Design an enzyme around this catalytic site. Structure first.
Site, short mmCIF file in Angstrom:
data_model
loop_
_atom_site.label_atom_id
_atom_site.label_comp_id
_atom_site.label_asym_id
_atom_site.label_seq_id
_atom_site.Cartn_x
_atom_site.Cartn_y
_atom_site.Cartn_z
N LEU A 1 0.80 -1.22 0.00
CA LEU A 1 0.00 0.00 0.00
C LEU A 1 0.83 1.27 0.00
CD1 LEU A 1 -2.59 -1.13 2.71
CD2 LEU A 1 -3.05 -0.87 0.25
N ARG B 1 7.92 -0.86 4.48
CA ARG B 1 6.74 -0.69 3.65
C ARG B 1 5.51 -1.06 4.47
N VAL B 2 4.35 -0.70 3.93
CA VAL B 2 3.06 -1.08 4.51
C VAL B 2 2.35 -1.99 3.52
CG1 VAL B 2 0.82 -0.26 5.33
CG2 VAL B 2 2.91 1.02 5.89
N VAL C 1 -7.59 1.13 6.29
CA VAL C 1 -8.39 2.31 5.95
C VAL C 1 -8.44 2.40 4.43
CG1 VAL C 1 -8.78 4.75 6.41
CG2 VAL C 1 -7.54 3.34 8.05
N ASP D 1 4.55 15.06 12.20
CA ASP D 1 4.65 14.76 10.77
C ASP D 1 3.29 14.88 10.09
OD1 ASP D 1 6.07 14.27 8.46
OD2 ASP D 1 6.04 12.09 8.72
N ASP E 1 1.13 6.95 10.76
CA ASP E 1 2.55 7.27 10.82
C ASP E 1 2.90 8.10 12.05
OD1 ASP E 1 5.20 7.44 10.30
OD2 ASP E 1 4.96 7.90 8.16
C1 LIG Z 1 1.90 4.16 3.58
O1 LIG Z 1 1.09 3.86 4.74
C2 LIG Z 1 -0.14 3.40 4.49
O2 LIG Z 1 -0.58 3.29 3.38
C3 LIG Z 1 -0.85 3.04 5.75
C4 LIG Z 1 -0.16 3.22 6.94
C5 LIG Z 1 -0.75 2.93 8.15
C6 LIG Z 1 -2.04 2.46 8.22
C7 LIG Z 1 -2.79 2.26 7.03
C8 LIG Z 1 -4.12 1.79 7.03
N1 LIG Z 1 -4.84 1.60 5.93
C9 LIG Z 1 -4.26 1.88 4.76
C10 LIG Z 1 -2.98 2.34 4.62
C11 LIG Z 1 -2.19 2.55 5.78
#
Ligand SMILES: COC(=O)c1cccc2cnccc12
EC number: 2.7.11.11
Lengths: 19, 339
Positions: free
Chosen positions: B40, B45-46, B112, B155, B173
């Site tokens: 994502l 990375r996520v 999310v 941030d 983050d």
């Molecule tokens: C680059 O970070 C993300 O994309 C992300 C980071 C933390 C929680 C999330 C939850 N639902 C989608 C994306 C995330």
């Protein structure tokens, strides 16, 4: 325009943090 | 008897936070509890993952321990996890699990699915003032909560604000979040969003978050940030100059709020005066904002992201996929003992 100057700039993508 | 006051609400929040802050959760899942789906976003990375037992989708942040050590981010990473497992607010992403293995740290958060505010903002160009105000109000309440716990966020930017299925914000983050009473000194953040006192190495406090809110509101309403250039050093020169230009379409109320948030003298900055956050909440630009209704999430959102079902990632960019390698030898065990 200021918008045009932004869109032509190098920082319209995702911005990295600094540390 | 009497209904609850804001002070009593925040005192309750502090007691709840401190219990978790002083006794953090650890090791609450493991990697083979999940199936890996897709990256994502990107020290790591996520990834979108699916929990095998429940079928729930989550966002799993993976951090390479050796890269964290090399980037000198050990303490910041310990801050991130200790804070995120202890907070609880309607606009903060929920940490569901955390664990570590020989190679990596893992933080598994609620997924999310609506994508980053960044993506929507760049695509549409700019948000209307009512639309920007709806998002700004959630950040104002979130910083009121965080700051009451002595947390500085450090941030804020559209890249870190995810849109949920109701159209509301989830802050993600916490990599630079820190619990501090008084001032701190780390040069960190994102160039466009740094307050002047960070750049000038002066020592700084939670007022940097209110400056960053000014940058965010400006960028949401203009479609570009108040200080931009091609190199960060030129951005910093503009930030410390004390000069901001506003689009002609900005309302007079918006310009007045922004001159008080983008105030280079932190001693005159809204959020940092004797009335604290209430100088912001009571400002004319927020006169139409029902703060309780935002907190209760009963306000209709400006838009709801498209959703094609669980696990859909259409609101996210595609990234190159790389294998998750776990070494047979434990790396950096001592450094991350408390994780
Ligand atoms: C680059 O970070 C993300 O994309 C992300 C980071 C933390 C929680 C999330 C939850 N639902 C989608 C994306 C995330």
């Amino acid at each position: 325009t200021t918008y045009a100057d932004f869109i032509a700039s190098g920082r319209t993508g995702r911005r990295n943090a600094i540390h | 008897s009497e209904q609850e006051s804001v002070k009593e609400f925040l005192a309750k929040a502090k007691e709840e936070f401190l219990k978790k802050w002083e006794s953090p959760s650890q090791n609450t899942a493991q990697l083979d509890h999940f199936d890996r789906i897709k990256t994502l976003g990107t020290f790591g990375r996520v990834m979108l993952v699916k929990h095998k037992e429940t079928g729930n989708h989550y966002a799993m942040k993976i951090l390479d321990k050796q890269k964290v050590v090399k980037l000198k981010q050990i303490e910041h990473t310990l801050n991130e996890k200790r804070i995120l497992q202890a907070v609880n607010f309607p606009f903060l992403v929920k940490l569901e699990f955390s664990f570590k293995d020989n190679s990596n740290l893992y933080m598994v958060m609620e997924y999310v699915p609506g994508g980053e505010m960044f993506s929507h903002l760049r695509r549409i160009g700019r948000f209307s003032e009512p639309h920007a105000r709806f998002y700004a109000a959630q950040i104002v309440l979130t910083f009121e909560y965080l700051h009451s716990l002595d947390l500085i966020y450090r941030d804020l930017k559209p890249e870190n604000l995810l849109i949920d299925q109701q159209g509301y914000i989830q802050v993600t983050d916490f990599g630079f979040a820190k619990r501090v009473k008084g001032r701190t000194w780390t040069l960190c953040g994102t160039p466009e969003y740094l307050a002047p006192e960070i750049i000038l190495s002066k020592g700084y406090n939670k007022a940097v978050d209110w400056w960053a809110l000014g940058v965010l509101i400006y960028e949401m309403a203009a479609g570009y940030p108040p200080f931009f250039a091609d190199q960060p050093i030129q951005i910093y020169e503009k930030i410390v100059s004390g000069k901001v230009r506003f689009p002609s379409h900005f309302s007079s109320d918006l310009k007045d709020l922004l001159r008080n948030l983008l105030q280079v003298d932190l001693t005159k900055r809204f959020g940092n005066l004797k009335n604290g956050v209430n100088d912001i909440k009571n400002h004319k630009w927020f006169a139409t904002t029902d703060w309780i209704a935002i907190y209760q999430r009963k306000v209709e959102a400006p838009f709801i992201p498209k959703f094609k079902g669980p696990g859909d990632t259409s609101n996210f960019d595609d990234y190159e996929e790389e294998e998750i390698r776990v070494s047979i030898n434990e790396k950096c065990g001592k450094e991350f003992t408390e994780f």
